[PDB]
Symmetry: C2
């Protein structure tokens, strides 16, 4: 049956209907490469990797854009320190981490510094159209004028709760004047400055996907102000909503507690992989970690603990044992298991807002069958075996993105 996606705009699961048949344009907010990528951000990027893989298995042609914030968003020549040196250091580490977790590369991976010119044009566009105003070298988005025209700022997060350069405190910066402390700067119509965080993603998303595209993803912390500002920028620039489906991935906790460097309940991705940490009793292969992650729904809070990870590992091994045993299973003239029925149960879970936990459970029905088949307690024809092998590898390696561990 057809795919359903939870949409943060409406708070309900919706029939997914693409703007262009057989095609999906998809944008996910990427890392700010001024420090090491956090584990919770890895989960978000892994969740949208799974979603990207699933959209392709279903047969869509998916253009997946995921940006890199290498300029601005500071809220996050040999003797002079170089911002681009830092950017390079954490960009490389970011890609090494994601490669270990077997994430596919996105179709396009634009950088904010790669699109200053496009962002300066959008700022001009919003100034000339009345949605923005220059103030002491910066440019701010006029929230109250945006509202007076009826465009409803806050429709995503559904909130109205809670300096001198701005007409109103809720105005946000599209362009910021560079102070002498700012090394990264660019000439512009308003002096030397650097981009506002939110306008980077609007310039980059619409350039490669259009004024309106199917899916926009990110962590739930981006819902406000970031994604709220992307919506307002897109509606004020193009006169239409930029995104039909807004997807938000949920938090990650450890031992039921929030991940905090200040609390001490903190662990970097590599520390969890290598076991160089005091929360987990061993090292863990990233595919085991990925398996564990996918046992939680991307909109659920994922909690990692030593006992939960060990349980995921035991379940991971059983799955892969069956995967190896399929190539050696014997064949009978009749099948006492219904592979067609299992695949329909597995597939429906997948197109039910990418329900990886339920999908994994249906995979265990096939795992249980493989060990039963091996001991002659069940039988299977050659055609059903070929079908079982194709579907099970496709779910395990292509959709879930798991991989074998020697």
């Amino acid at each position: 049956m057809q795919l359903k996606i939870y949409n943060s705009l409406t708070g309900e699961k919706e029939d997914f209907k693409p703007i262009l048949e057989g095609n999906v344009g998809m944008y996910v907010c990427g890392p700010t490469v001024y420090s090491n990528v956090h584990l919770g951000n890895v989960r978000t990027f892994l969740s949208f990797d799974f979603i990207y893989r699933s959209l392709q298995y279903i047969g869509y042609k998916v253009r997946y854009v995921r940006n890199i914030t290498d300029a601005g968003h500071l809220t996050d020549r040999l003797e002079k320190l170089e911002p681009m040196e830092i950017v390079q250091k954490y960009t490389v580490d970011f890609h090494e981490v994601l490669k270990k977790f077997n994430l596919l590369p996105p179709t396009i991976e634009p950088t904010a510094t790669g699109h200053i010119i496009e962002q300066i044009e959008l700022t001009k566009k919003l100034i000339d159209t009345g949605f923005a105003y220059e103030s002491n070298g910066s440019v701010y988005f006029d929230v109250l004028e945006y509202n007076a025209r009826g465009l409803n700022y806050g429709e995503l997060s559904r909130r109205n709760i809670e300096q001198g350069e701005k007409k109103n405190p809720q105005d946000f910066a599209l362009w910021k004047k560079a102070s002498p402390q700012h090394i990264m700067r660019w000439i512009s119509p308003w002096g030397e400055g650097f981009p506002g965080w939110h306008l980077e993603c609007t310039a980059m998303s619409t350039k490669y996907l259009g004024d309106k595209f199917d899916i926009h993803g990110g962590g739930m912390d981006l819902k406000f102000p970031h994604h709220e500002c992307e919506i307002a920028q897109g509606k004020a620039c193009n006169g239409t909503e930029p995104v039909n489906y807004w997807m938000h991935a949920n938090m990650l906790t450890m031992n039921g507690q929030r991940m905090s460097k200040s609390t001490g309940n903190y662990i970097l991705p590599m520390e969890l992989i290598t076991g160089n940490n005091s929360f987990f009793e061993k090292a863990f292969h990233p595919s085991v970690l990925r398996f564990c992650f996918l046992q939680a729904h991307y909109r659920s809070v994922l909690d990692i603990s030593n006992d939960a990870m060990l349980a995921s590992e035991k379940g991971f091994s059983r799955l892969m044992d069956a995967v190896k045993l399929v190539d050696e299973l014997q064949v009978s003239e009749k099948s006492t298991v219904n592979v067609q029925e299992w695949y329909e149960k597995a597939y429906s879970a997948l197109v039910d807002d990418f329900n990886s936990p339920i999908l994994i459970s249906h995979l265990f029905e096939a795992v249980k069958w493989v060990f039963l088949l091996k001991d002659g307690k069940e039988t299977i024809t050659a055609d059903d075996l070929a079908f079982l092998k194709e579907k099970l590898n496709a779910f395990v390696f292509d959709v879930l993105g798991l991989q074998t561990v020697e």
Copy 2:
């Protein structure tokens, strides 16, 4: 003793003298990511990886900039094909290839699209200064005026051998008008266009290293026109030579013949690694391939063949066997080998224009000693053994960039 570097400007080995004590600024021309990275380009990037590593072992603080040409140099929205999709595909593959060959990441890795704004300013600079002129939306560098002022175009390649928009046929483009066929374009003072290849590297090199920096590297095919144009651009912009030491890596051949897709004498890096090719009789670990490469001097032509690679592999194994056997060697009260003398021979080869073949030969003296030590035919004190272990691992893993193969 002190480092000597061959300089293409003078055609001789020169005492290396840095612009700033204990520091090296270093720029190497990077790949054009519109196709798969060629093996010969891998050799060039591997040669400068070795050089980068060697400059650090010697104790210099090295800022290594290596660019990416993701816009322009074409001489090299869901339904519309996307240049940035292609760029992304071959950028990822480029980094995966180099990671397999154990190259370090450069300190900064700028992209041409990341610096359109800086390149537009340099073009203005050269127009206002008389070195360049607008012509039908493009901007061209005036070679004859550059020469009339005495700046000698051609000092690098030492040549003068061998359309309607240009004052003279030797003029080269700093900025090119975009035709409707060009998807990649940018607004500018002269209309919509895209950067000229040569001016990308001048804007990017000087921004992160200064108006004059120590070393500029690249393949020997870049000497003209590319590096000749970088010299002219830097001298016309800044009134001084941009580079004190010009380094050029030489060609790669297979079976004594030129690598050509048209000839059929062609092999991609991954095909050589995986053995999925008809020139080599097996697969080869990239560290073995890297060892083979470093047995040729970076300014020599490297020829790869099945018999040469097998010989390199046999020599690679012997080296690593000794490397493993050092931790188990027994110690005596006296040393019948002079580790101090060997290290001085090994180090002098290194600072003799990065003479990896000679350095590897001196490493085999230490390899020969390790097998002799194991059989009691030679002796060594504990202090000499500790020194031998430190220097030999440092040359093998840190300088040569080799790695163990399980």
